[PDB]
Amino acid sequence: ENFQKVEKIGEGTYGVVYKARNKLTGEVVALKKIRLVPSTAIREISLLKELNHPNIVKLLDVIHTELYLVFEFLHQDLKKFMDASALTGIPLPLIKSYLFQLLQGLAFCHSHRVLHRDLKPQNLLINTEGAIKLADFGLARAFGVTLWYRAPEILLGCKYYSTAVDIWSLGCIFAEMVTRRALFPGDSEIDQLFRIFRTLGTPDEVVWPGVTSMPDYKPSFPKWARQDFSKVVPPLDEDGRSLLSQMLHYDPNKRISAKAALAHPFFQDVTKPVPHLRL
Ligand SMILES: CC(C)(O)Cn1cc(-c2nc(NC3CCN(S(=O)(=O)C4CC4)CC3)ncc2C(F)(F)F)cn1
């Protein structure tokens, strides 16, 4: 009744997303219809209405009548942009700008103990003004599949994972912007873990204390040597490779925080370019 659906723009784990217009006000929004409401989800989603930041997609309204989530609408995601930019690549100053802004978004959310848990290029939304924003923060915790961006602690069965899972995912996305190919495109959970291990080396107690005690760890995992890191994201410079290395540390406690990543020398020359978007 209150929204005219314009077109289907996405499908998440929790429901279909439509571009829609408010019939009273004329505001254009993204309207997510949540699939099959538990009272704890209502309370958790209501708290996310408060979590406002320029690099977080705004949750405008929660409508529990007879659950719909009304979000800010952006015109493109980073997957479509990367695919449009595949001949030439995204220029490094724009990659750097986007990574910086996404680390600002993560630093804000993490400072409020809110995790994303499922970052992927389709969750990263851009506009014509050079902004990039994170979509879906806090929904995984509120409500309770691409594996390519999943942290190794998740894949090894850790129940009580941390803000570090989002840094991992963002490092994977960073690498993909630079190289124009997904870093770890696994098509099952074991294929995902084995692709990580084939690049970064099979983890052991030296690099990741406690790893051999993790729920899904098996002593029978093959033991791959770690690849030379300059083979992973050529031709990214040593500042970018250093930052990526720190985002992809196995040990979640060693992995760089969003806040510390913002201070990395890679961002010494950061700027805010505007992308040419074809809408
Ligand atoms: C993935 C998910 C799980 O995040 C759920 N999901 C959420 C959205 C969403 N989408 C938009 N805008 C769209 C962005 C993609 N582009 S595209 O590149 O032309 C198209 C993909 C080819 C169309 C416009 N704006 C806001 C949101 C929200 F606020 F809801 F996040 C889309 N899917």
Report yes or no: 124 and 135 within 8 Å, Cβ to Cβ. yes
d(CA 48, CA 258): 20
Catalytic residues: 118
d(CA 185, CA 142): 27
Instruction: Please give the resolution of this entry in Å, rounded to 1 decimal.
Output: 1.5
d(CA 73, CA 209): 43
Amino acid identity of residue 88, one-letter, is T
**From the annotation, which residues make up the binding site for Mg(2+)?**
123, 136
Q: How far is CA 218 from the centre of its chain?
A: 28
d(CA 150, CA 155): 7
Q: Which atom of ligand 1 is nearest to the CA of 72?
A: 29
User: How many helices and strands in the chain, by DSSP H and E?
Assistant: 9, 8
With helix as H, strand as E and coil as C, how does 224-252 read?
CCCCCHHHCCCCCCHHHHHHHHHHCCCCC
- The kind and range of the H/E element at 98 are helix 92-111
d(CA 134, CA 116): 9
Report yes or no: 177 and 95 within 8 Å, Cβ to Cβ. yes
Q: The tokens of 47 are what?
A: 């708290």
d(CA 135, CA 141): 14
**Cα(99) to centroid of ligand 1, in Å?**
19
Burial (CB count within 10 angstroms: exposed 0-12, middle 13-18, buried 19+), residue 81: buried
**Cα(76) to centroid of ligand 1, in Å?**
7
d(CA 255, CA 252): 5
Q: Which atom of ligand 1 is nearest to the CA of 279?
A: 19
> Tokens 């309204």, residue?
61
d(CA 216, CA 211): 10
Report yes or no: 117 and 166 within 8 Å, Cβ to Cβ. yes
Q: Which atom of ligand 1 is nearest to the CA of 73?
A: 25
Sign of CA dihedral 92, 263, 169, 121: negative
Cis peptide before 222 (omega within 30 of 0): no
> Which residues are near ligand 1 (CB < 6 Å)?
9-10, 12, 17, 30, 32, 57, 71-77, 80, 122-123, 125, 135-136
From 6, 13, 17, give the residue whose CB has the most ligand 1 atoms within 8 Å, as the site to mutate. Answer: 17
Atom 4 of ligand 1 has which residue's CA nearest to it?
Answer: 123
**Cα(72) to centroid of ligand 1, in Å?**
10
Q: How far is CA 28 from the centre of its chain?
A: 24
Count of C-beta atoms within a 10 Å radius of residue 78: 22
Q: How many residues does the chain have?
A: 279
Catalogue all structural domains in the chain, each as residue range(s) with its CATH number: 3-72 (3.30.200.20), 77-267 (1.10.510.10)
**Cα(74) to centroid of ligand 1, in Å?**
7
Report yes or no: 205 and 213 within 8 Å, Cβ to Cβ. no
CA distances from 22 to 2, 75, 222 (A): 6, 17, 55
* Secondary structure of residue 30 in the 3-state scheme: strand
Atom 19 of ligand 1 has which residue's CA nearest to it?
Answer: 76
Atom 31 of ligand 1 has which residue's CA nearest to it?
Answer: 135
Residue numbers after which the chain is interrupted (C to N above 2.5 A) read 36, 66, 144
Report yes or no: 68 and 33 within 8 Å, Cβ to Cβ. yes
* Secondary structure of residue 192 in the 3-state scheme: helix
What angle (nearest 5°) sits at the alpha carbon of residue 70, between those of residues 66 and 76?
A: 145
The structure was resolved experimentally with X-ray
d(CA 88, CA 85): 6
Q: The tokens of 244 are what?
A: 């990526």
